[PDB]
mmCIF file of all heavy atoms in Angstrom:
data_model
loop_
_atom_site.group_PDB
_atom_site.id
_atom_site.type_symbol
_atom_site.label_atom_id
_atom_site.label_comp_id
_atom_site.label_asym_id
_atom_site.label_seq_id
_atom_site.Cartn_x
_atom_site.Cartn_y
_atom_site.Cartn_z
ATOM 1 N N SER A 1 105.693 87.387 100.010
ATOM 2 C CA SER A 1 104.485 88.176 100.249
ATOM 3 C C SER A 1 104.249 88.448 101.732
ATOM 4 O O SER A 1 103.193 88.981 102.061
ATOM 5 C CB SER A 1 103.195 87.499 99.761
ATOM 6 O OG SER A 1 103.379 86.788 98.566
ATOM 7 N N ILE A 2 105.036 87.884 102.640
ATOM 8 C CA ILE A 2 104.737 87.988 104.060
ATOM 9 C C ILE A 2 105.649 88.990 104.746
ATOM 10 O O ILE A 2 106.836 88.725 104.935
ATOM 11 C CB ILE A 2 104.814 86.620 104.751
ATOM 12 C CG1 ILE A 2 103.992 85.606 103.950
ATOM 13 C CG2 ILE A 2 104.359 86.793 106.160
ATOM 14 C CD1 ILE A 2 104.090 84.201 104.445
ATOM 15 N N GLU A 3 105.054 90.071 105.247
ATOM 16 C CA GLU A 3 105.747 91.166 105.912
ATOM 17 C C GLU A 3 105.363 91.239 107.393
ATOM 18 O O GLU A 3 104.255 90.867 107.814
ATOM 19 C CB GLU A 3 105.415 92.508 105.233
ATOM 20 C CG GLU A 3 106.598 93.456 105.000
ATOM 21 C CD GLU A 3 106.168 94.867 104.559
ATOM 22 O OE1 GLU A 3 105.483 94.998 103.507
ATOM 23 O OE2 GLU A 3 106.537 95.841 105.263
ATOM 24 N N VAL A 4 106.315 91.715 108.173
ATOM 25 C CA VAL A 4 106.210 91.803 109.606
ATOM 26 C C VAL A 4 106.453 93.248 109.974
ATOM 27 O O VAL A 4 107.578 93.729 109.819
ATOM 28 C CB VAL A 4 107.262 90.913 110.289
ATOM 29 C CG1 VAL A 4 107.420 91.307 111.731
ATOM 30 C CG2 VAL A 4 106.929 89.438 110.153
ATOM 31 N N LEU A 5 105.466 93.890 110.595
ATOM 32 C CA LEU A 5 105.580 95.279 111.009
ATOM 33 C C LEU A 5 105.518 95.329 112.519
ATOM 34 O O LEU A 5 104.684 94.652 113.126
ATOM 35 C CB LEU A 5 104.467 96.149 110.443
ATOM 36 C CG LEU A 5 104.225 96.041 108.937
ATOM 37 C CD1 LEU A 5 102.967 95.259 108.663
ATOM 38 C CD2 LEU A 5 104.163 97.434 108.371
ATOM 39 N N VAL A 6 106.386 96.127 113.129
ATOM 40 C CA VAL A 6 106.332 96.324 114.572
ATOM 41 C C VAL A 6 105.310 97.411 114.863
ATOM 42 O O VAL A 6 105.475 98.575 114.484
ATOM 43 C CB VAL A 6 107.699 96.688 115.135
ATOM 44 C CG1 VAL A 6 107.578 96.988 116.577
ATOM 45 C CG2 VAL A 6 108.603 95.534 114.876
ATOM 46 N N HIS A 7 104.232 97.018 115.518
ATOM 47 C CA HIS A 7 103.125 97.901 115.866
ATOM 48 C C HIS A 7 102.953 97.770 117.375
ATOM 49 O O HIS A 7 102.135 96.961 117.840
ATOM 50 C CB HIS A 7 101.897 97.478 115.070
ATOM 51 C CG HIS A 7 100.659 98.220 115.428
ATOM 52 N ND1 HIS A 7 100.677 99.540 115.820
ATOM 53 C CD2 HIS A 7 99.362 97.826 115.456
ATOM 54 C CE1 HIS A 7 99.439 99.932 116.075
ATOM 55 N NE2 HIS A 7 98.624 98.909 115.868
ATOM 56 N N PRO A 8 103.687 98.565 118.170
ATOM 57 C CA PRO A 8 103.638 98.426 119.656
ATOM 58 C C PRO A 8 102.240 98.558 120.272
ATOM 59 O O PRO A 8 101.940 97.968 121.319
ATOM 60 C CB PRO A 8 104.529 99.577 120.149
ATOM 61 C CG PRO A 8 105.381 99.987 118.944
ATOM 62 C CD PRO A 8 104.528 99.693 117.719
ATOM 63 N N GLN A 9 101.368 99.352 119.690
ATOM 64 C CA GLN A 9 100.092 99.553 120.342
ATOM 65 C C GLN A 9 99.210 98.327 120.199
ATOM 66 O O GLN A 9 98.195 98.213 120.897
ATOM 67 C CB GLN A 9 99.437 100.801 119.777
ATOM 68 C CG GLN A 9 100.241 102.111 120.032
ATOM 69 C CD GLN A 9 101.404 102.251 119.097
ATOM 70 O OE1 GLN A 9 101.389 101.697 118.009
ATOM 71 N NE2 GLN A 9 102.406 103.003 119.497
ATOM 72 N N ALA A 10 99.549 97.430 119.285
ATOM 73 C CA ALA A 10 98.835 96.170 119.158
ATOM 74 C C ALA A 10 97.367 96.414 118.883
ATOM 75 O O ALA A 10 96.524 95.586 119.227
ATOM 76 C CB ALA A 10 99.018 95.285 120.387
ATOM 77 N N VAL A 11 97.052 97.577 118.312
ATOM 78 C CA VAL A 11 95.675 97.852 117.940
ATOM 79 C C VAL A 11 95.311 97.143 116.652
ATOM 80 O O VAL A 11 94.223 96.578 116.541
ATOM 81 C CB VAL A 11 95.444 99.369 117.857
ATOM 82 C CG1 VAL A 11 94.075 99.677 117.241
ATOM 83 C CG2 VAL A 11 95.591 99.970 119.271
ATOM 84 N N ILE A 12 96.189 97.164 115.648
ATOM 85 C CA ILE A 12 95.930 96.476 114.383
ATOM 86 C C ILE A 12 96.472 95.069 114.548
ATOM 87 O O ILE A 12 97.672 94.894 114.740
ATOM 88 C CB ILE A 12 96.589 97.200 113.202
ATOM 89 C CG1 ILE A 12 96.032 98.619 113.119
ATOM 90 C CG2 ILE A 12 96.385 96.483 111.889
ATOM 91 C CD1 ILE A 12 96.130 99.228 111.786
ATOM 92 N N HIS A 13 95.582 94.075 114.505
ATOM 93 C CA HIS A 13 95.949 92.690 114.774
ATOM 94 C C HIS A 13 96.563 92.001 113.557
ATOM 95 O O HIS A 13 97.251 90.987 113.707
ATOM 96 C CB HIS A 13 94.722 91.937 115.338
ATOM 97 C CG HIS A 13 94.375 92.332 116.748
ATOM 98 N ND1 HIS A 13 95.195 93.130 117.519
ATOM 99 C CD2 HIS A 13 93.313 92.026 117.532
ATOM 100 C CE1 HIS A 13 94.644 93.323 118.703
ATOM 101 N NE2 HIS A 13 93.500 92.665 118.736
ATOM 102 N N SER A 14 96.323 92.493 112.359
ATOM 103 C CA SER A 14 97.065 92.035 111.178
ATOM 104 C C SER A 14 96.252 92.419 109.971
ATOM 105 O O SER A 14 95.111 92.861 110.130
ATOM 106 C CB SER A 14 97.360 90.534 111.164
ATOM 107 O OG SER A 14 98.509 90.271 111.963
ATOM 108 N N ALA A 15 96.809 92.288 108.770
ATOM 109 C CA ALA A 15 96.133 92.837 107.593
ATOM 110 C C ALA A 15 96.515 92.119 106.303
ATOM 111 O O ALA A 15 97.544 91.421 106.228
ATOM 112 C CB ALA A 15 96.453 94.322 107.464
ATOM 113 N N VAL A 16 95.681 92.326 105.272
ATOM 114 C CA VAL A 16 95.950 91.800 103.943
ATOM 115 C C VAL A 16 95.851 92.924 102.939
ATOM 116 O O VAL A 16 94.978 93.801 103.041
ATOM 117 C CB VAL A 16 94.988 90.671 103.563
ATOM 118 C CG1 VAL A 16 95.200 89.494 104.500
ATOM 119 C CG2 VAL A 16 93.578 91.162 103.658
ATOM 120 N N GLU A 17 96.770 92.910 101.986
ATOM 121 C CA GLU A 17 96.726 93.813 100.863
ATOM 122 C C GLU A 17 96.208 93.035 99.661
ATOM 123 O O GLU A 17 96.625 91.895 99.432
ATOM 124 C CB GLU A 17 98.102 94.397 100.593
ATOM 125 C CG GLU A 17 98.158 95.579 99.596
ATOM 126 C CD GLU A 17 99.482 96.353 99.707
ATOM 127 O OE1 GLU A 17 99.770 96.899 100.805
ATOM 128 O OE2 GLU A 17 100.232 96.412 98.710
ATOM 129 N N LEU A 18 95.276 93.638 98.904
ATOM 130 C CA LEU A 18 94.664 92.943 97.775
ATOM 131 C C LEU A 18 95.184 93.503 96.453
ATOM 132 O O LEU A 18 95.937 94.473 96.418
ATOM 133 C CB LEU A 18 93.142 93.017 97.856
ATOM 134 C CG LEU A 18 92.592 92.501 99.188
ATOM 135 C CD1 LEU A 18 91.134 92.760 99.272
ATOM 136 C CD2 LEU A 18 92.884 91.020 99.385
ATOM 137 N N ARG A 19 94.795 92.839 95.360
ATOM 138 C CA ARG A 19 95.330 93.149 94.041
ATOM 139 C C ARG A 19 95.216 94.621 93.646
ATOM 140 O O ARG A 19 96.040 95.137 92.881
ATOM 141 C CB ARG A 19 94.527 92.437 92.965
ATOM 142 C CG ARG A 19 94.793 91.072 92.729
ATOM 143 C CD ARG A 19 93.529 90.451 92.181
ATOM 144 N NE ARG A 19 92.962 91.110 91.009
ATOM 145 C CZ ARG A 19 93.435 90.919 89.772
ATOM 146 N NH1 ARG A 19 94.472 90.138 89.590
ATOM 147 N NH2 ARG A 19 92.886 91.499 88.716
ATOM 148 N N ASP A 20 94.139 95.261 94.032
ATOM 149 C CA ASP A 20 93.877 96.653 93.694
ATOM 150 C C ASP A 20 94.569 97.622 94.620
ATOM 151 O O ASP A 20 94.296 98.815 94.541
ATOM 152 C CB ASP A 20 92.381 96.931 93.672
ATOM 153 C CG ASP A 20 91.675 96.506 94.925
ATOM 154 O OD1 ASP A 20 92.279 95.836 95.800
ATOM 155 O OD2 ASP A 20 90.482 96.852 95.034
ATOM 156 N N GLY A 21 95.337 97.132 95.588
ATOM 157 C CA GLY A 21 95.952 98.004 96.560
ATOM 158 C C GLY A 21 95.105 98.345 97.762
ATOM 159 O O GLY A 21 95.524 99.184 98.563
ATOM 160 N N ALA A 22 93.956 97.708 97.932
ATOM 161 C CA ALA A 22 93.193 97.869 99.165
ATOM 162 C C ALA A 22 93.777 96.971 100.255
ATOM 163 O O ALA A 22 94.115 95.800 100.012
ATOM 164 C CB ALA A 22 91.727 97.512 98.962
ATOM 165 N N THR A 23 93.956 97.537 101.434
ATOM 166 C CA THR A 23 94.370 96.779 102.603
ATOM 167 C C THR A 23 93.180 96.621 103.546
ATOM 168 O O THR A 23 92.522 97.599 103.894
ATOM 169 C CB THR A 23 95.518 97.461 103.345
ATOM 170 O OG1 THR A 23 96.722 97.392 102.573
ATOM 171 C CG2 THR A 23 95.773 96.756 104.651
ATOM 172 N N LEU A 24 92.908 95.395 103.944
ATOM 173 C CA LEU A 24 91.870 95.072 104.911
ATOM 174 C C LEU A 24 92.534 94.702 106.231
ATOM 175 O O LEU A 24 93.391 93.806 106.273
ATOM 176 C CB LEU A 24 91.022 93.923 104.389
ATOM 177 C CG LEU A 24 90.364 94.366 103.082
ATOM 178 C CD1 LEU A 24 89.659 93.195 102.463
ATOM 179 C CD2 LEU A 24 89.402 95.469 103.377
ATOM 180 N N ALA A 25 92.165 95.408 107.305
ATOM 181 C CA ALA A 25 92.764 95.164 108.613
ATOM 182 C C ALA A 25 91.693 94.928 109.677
ATOM 183 O O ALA A 25 90.615 95.524 109.664
ATOM 184 C CB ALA A 25 93.655 96.319 109.027
#
């Protein structure tokens, strides 16, 4: 369940995807 995305701007500090497909960041 643990994914690593390269986000150079470092604006999004990290996120969770929930059962319904909503992502909270």
